[model samples]
Target chain A: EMLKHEYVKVNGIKMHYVTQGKGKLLLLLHGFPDFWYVWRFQIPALAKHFRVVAPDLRGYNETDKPEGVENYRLDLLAKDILGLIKALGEEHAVVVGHDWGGIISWTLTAFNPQAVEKLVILNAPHPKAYMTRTKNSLRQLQKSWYVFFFQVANIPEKILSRNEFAFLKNMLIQSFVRRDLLTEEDLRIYVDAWSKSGALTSALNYYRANLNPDIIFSEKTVVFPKIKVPTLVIWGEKDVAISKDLIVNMEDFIEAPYSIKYFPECGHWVQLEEPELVRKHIEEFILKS
Target chain B: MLKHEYVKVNGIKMHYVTQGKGKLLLLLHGFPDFWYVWRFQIPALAKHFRVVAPDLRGYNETDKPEGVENYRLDLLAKDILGLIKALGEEHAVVVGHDWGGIISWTLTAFNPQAVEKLVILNAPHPKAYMTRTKNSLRQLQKSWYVFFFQVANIPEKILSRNEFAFLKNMLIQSFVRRDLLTEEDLRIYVDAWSKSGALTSALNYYRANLNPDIIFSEKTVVFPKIKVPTLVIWGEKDVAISKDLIVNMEDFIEAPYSIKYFPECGHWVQLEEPELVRKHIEEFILK
Candidate 1:
């Protein structure tokens, strides 16, 4: 529970980050509907070996929420991390991400290769793999229907915040086969952080921004330039957000030394659902790297 | 759909219900479950191929004898093989769930000529199952009740006399969707179990059977990697059968195989998520 909070001004926006331990830099990024607190289990464990830095991406709690969709673009988001690294006096850091964080991690490595050393993604798909599979795979399309629903304005935030407690509680129960690992106190902590700062709207902005006019017009084919950095993709096969087929196709995007592990019976929240397995894999990947 | 009904086989009278008009398809049911378990796959499959569901040896209105030896796996497999002979069909699609599934896999491995296609639900191969049980603490914990049933006279009394509670627990605790178990459905199972001397024969399947050593020593089966197309539908949350068994089963079946793991399902895969299971099975069997 040793968490050190700090803020750094990057591109005139105050970005909040939590850092623990001190060694080779490890930047941890969290995904949608979650804050840096998603890395709580990994932070202390990884921090033991490497300096684990978890930052609240733009629009999330403590991170500056700028108006308009362009401000929240993946490139801008990736720039935030690049700037943060320079500000922190680090040349490069091992990057790890889950959910949307996974997308950003891949984007950063793909867009700015020099900024990252190694990549570890949890329960998220590579953009090109996801785009390709979603077009053809009906199973994936059905699984991702919720993402389309999130593209709308305010409706998602309203629905989520209305029964936030009930909704999150049910999600936790349904997502994990072993519910005993996450305590009621742990839930209260999440709810407390979620409710205190208006984070839901900010988080939803990431989805809204992706469908923005400019980004859509760009229509840029997601060309995952041969990822030379060693990459490890851990997928919980039961993830409702992304299809397992995407995880299988991740190797096509990476030209570097890469490996993929599929947790057979876990949901979207693999870190929380199976923390020990996640920790073991992360540590092993880092050791091997 | 040419369904050869009341196809008499062995000493016990058997009913082989089929649908569709192509290759023959045979379905077998397990204990504490019945042919209706395949209710979803039957009609749809009947459209493409001849699908068959038989009330296995000692369950439902099927033949139930006083002896334990009558319900052996070999005898159970033979009954279906005999049904094939009586029906004047060379080969048919074979599908089995729970205990029936165990018999079907063994049947395909033992008599390859008798089966053209095989689909197993939730249940593992008898040899692998017996092997896993020896070391698997999870399997042992889940199967403790099976050992308890081995005790003479008690299990039959508990299962038969208190059939309501037994049936209720099976319906409620073992299903992912409890609402699917309607009163009518519960009555169907209850009526099946309450039939004259059906419960004993079902329980006797365990009593008559010995360890894997006995099964293997008596009949050494070199089941050539299954040449028939195989589909495995497993409920990941099955309390009795570990999901891990399903993962490794592919090594045994050398045919074109596909597995559909239902995340939100339990021991009763067909009953819990009937629609999804049916859809997958239809696509698999027909394709």
Candidate 2:
């Protein structure tokens, strides 16, 4: 029940985090247009079983906001997690992530497998899987228009930040299959978090910095390292942004015990929509293993 | 049975054929085509609704005016809008092919009130065409004619030589159902292209809309979402328009959008599979 707010210097930035339930460390990473608060429903339940720590991923909430696209590369984001794990006084922990958080977790496991004991990816594909699906499917490319649109430096920020983040408010709320899951108060908290000075740009830089111009326009293939950590991918089939086809060919990237769980009725905001189910799955994947 | 009529619309005397008696369905033909292109469609469609196929501003019996600007996209769209008004009706269910499909898209966007339901066969939306042509090397290669047609006086002579031998072969060779169109069917198109000022007017469409200055100005242009329900029929093997145009087509339409893809057919879906296209058009309208 007790939630502690703490700050640790990771990757040369003052990272803000929420910690509760003292035990072996369990890191909860949040995705784009989100803060540690997105784990509001999962933090308490997961904390009861393990020392749960949810961080306001760099450029979000009370964390230090960095300038330029270079600061937000996937490796740098993964390093921030690696640094956070070391700062938490743990060599490895059961890492559970959603969306961007899940993406960061995949990167961490691939590049620094020692930092992750087990990886649970929710609605985020492996980088290699994403690249493969994007290369082969026009449907995926069409769904990923926002990715390319976000690549444009200032326009996405202006468009998303307009009318007090009306577009984002509608997007997060409207994207849910269970409409009542995200209420007005939840949206207000999200907006307030986004309202932080330069947070919107920093958040956008995550997309801008990571996407290479060569891969987008030209037929260049990027080679990503195989993920060695035992992984479980939980997907919401109704996700409009990422197609279900992205879940294909998983055996190619993850060489360890890799599995998938799909929720046909849920949308992109899977964890929030089925918090209890996600919490239970996280516990089972961690404890049963 | 078809009734031929002439109406002065948008400063040109447009020739159109009409049949049937319910809600008006207007058909606009593409470049290198006349109203007869819909001959396979009119009788079947007339069973459920009134059908009219018009020779677009620069084609067939339609009066062709001189100059490139005379056939701007807006003027071409207005010509159809005016035809609907002159037909003693408020709005019509519009169907278009190729250039006519382009005009139908513009008319529906610019004058939503004049179009009830929109049906397009093998024509890419203007926004989609511009986006594809600019970015895609494959589409740019496919759209060679668009650049070549921008030249003055040369396209007309080259196309009209040997009694439209070049144009006739293009249609025949590109078609998947070559058996459907006999020599008689081929003559109908050449006769339309041979009309005075018709050949130049058709080419003017490219000069007016796709010239360097026009393309530059239109590069960042945003076409408004179509408010009316739209049905897009695409022949995947269409050499001119890539099948990729059908991707995310719903983004351009606010109303319900549906697509009927015929992988075996080419650009001329109606001529290749007339019965199937007719049934789909009829079903879309009734729904």
Candidate 3:
């Protein structure tokens, strides 16, 4: 079977995604500096069981590159999701996202809770837990200095452009003691996705939109309502961008079944590094009624 | 050893009861209650440390400050901050229960600079409570009285009727061990409610938090994680606050913390189960 490509007009922009399988809508989301390819290994495996779709979240490769940081606020990024599934006539989707994608999936569920049946988040700090920790946490602040640096325009992408995307590749793959998991073939695909026009800037806008002082510290509280759908979290023990020890209690807000699993010796790329384990976990968790 | 005295705090005289003289530990009481409510634990706690229990603003014997902002969380927290500073201490352990416990939790968030150890019984964090309210309808049903209290005059009358039978039942029925509230104990709370403006003041605590809609429209402040060592004890059988409201709120506090639950106890935890409460507070505050 061949993977199908398509363009969608969602949330007021022409969105791009790769779709496979036939049954329920299983949406896959990729984080910063990468596209649908980050989910390449699990897509085929999970597609055998459910309809698997991966989107290049707004600012990445082949998706419409809308201008300005405001275009990429977490809620709007979530609206894009709401629109896609609605366009696909999907009343429900088993939403999966990693890194920026994890937070985005949560935003999606929060915005349109009735639209989700199940949700899977990876290495993404739930926003409430993230805001609480980093508001004054010097350790989190130090680990997240890149967030502050990204606050300033154009400084980060210039640094990532060094030596033909060495910094981007290194950030994604460097700490993986499981280097065999991310091979030369894997490296080539990610670099090709990054090489797409306006890709890096679009991804940068996600950091910009979410971290804006108005959204971050406004008088009007943006309520990230507790998820109504069954949600699961899987963390890579070695994730540097997000702390593993800072375990967030997501079950507090979920009205339905909520569970968590951790990947030992895995880095930020849990799905890619340990695809078989991630598939079995999703298969059993989703298939059980 | 004294009956009561008034201390000027935040431009008003606050009524308080004090006994003993060593380390200062302030006790704050909740709505429909007074400093006298700590009767079961004070003698034992004061044996080891100076114990001071104050009737919080809008309750029996306190200033009974008028208007919404007067009872606003910041002002309530301010009164306590002023109380400890005026007592001429750097910091002291603050223990609060019921509405008193609500204030105690806020004090930890608002004025950690003045708390040595924060101890709370059965009061949820203001933000977490709102989050729970927004998400859980079961919680909203349990908290129906908060809406009732938002009424202007009738709620005050409903509470103060039949010699304050409603308030009496609230205190007595909420406890698994009904005999603990005693007949003599009933007389004291009734007399306190009969005081001029006491009924209005007590209802203001509900009014300020619930807003004009008698509905929860809130700004969930991301209060700086309390660095003070915190201890929390919850009664699992709480009638007004659902057990579902109980969850790991450790995310809000930065320091070392511990939480314990009582399956057998009710909303009036300290009174419902004294020995257990006294033991935990004594053990945790000790060096």
Query: Whose TM-score is greatest here?
Result: 2
Candidate 2 lDDT at B88 equals 89
Ranking by lDDT: 2, 3, 1
Worst 10-residue lDDT window for candidate 2 chain A reads A211-220
Q: Which candidate ranks first by DockQ, i.e. highest?
A: 2
- Candidate 2's residue-wise lDDT over A1-289, tens digit each? 6999999998699999999998889999999878899899898888888999999998999999989989998889999999999988889988888888988898999888887999999998777777655645555655664565566556567767878887677666657898577678987888899999999989988876765433432345666788888888899898877877888778778888977888888888888888899889888888887
Evaluate chain B of model 3: give its TM-score.
Answer: 0.95
A283: Cα error in model 1, Å: 2.0
- Candidate 1 clash pair list: B20-B46, B24-B92, B24-B93, B25-B52, B26-B93
The sequence of per-residue lDDT tens digits that candidate 1 reaches over residues B132-193 is: 55445455445544544454564565555555574466447666775877788778878888
| Residue A283, candidate 2: alpha-carbon lDDT | 89
Clashing residue pairs for model 3: B97-B101
lDDT tens digits by residue: candidate 3, A1-289: 5689999898689988998898989999988767888888888898898999998888888899888988888878888888999989888899998888888898888768888888998888888767655533434433454564455466567767657887667655554657566678877777777878878888888877786433432334446788878888898877766664355666655667788898878877788778899988888878996
How many residue pairs collide in each prediction? 5, 0, 1
The CA lDDT at A67 in model 1 is 75
Per-residue CA lDDT of model 2 for B1-287, tens digit only, reads 78999998867898889999999999888867889989899999998888999888878888888888898898989888899999889999999999999999999999999999999998888888777654554554455456556555655766777787767766676788757677887777777787888889888988788754443232376799999999999889887776666688888989999999999999989988899999999999998
Q: Which CAPRI level is candidate 1?
A: incorrect
TM-score of 2: 0.59
Could you tell which candidate, 1 or 2, scores higher by DockQ? 2
TM-score, B chain, candidate 2?
A: 0.96
Query: How do the residues B107-192 of candidate 3 rate in per-residue lDDT, one tens digit apiece?
Result: 88877888999888888877777666645545654564564455467567656767987677666766788588668878877888
Docking class of 2: incorrect
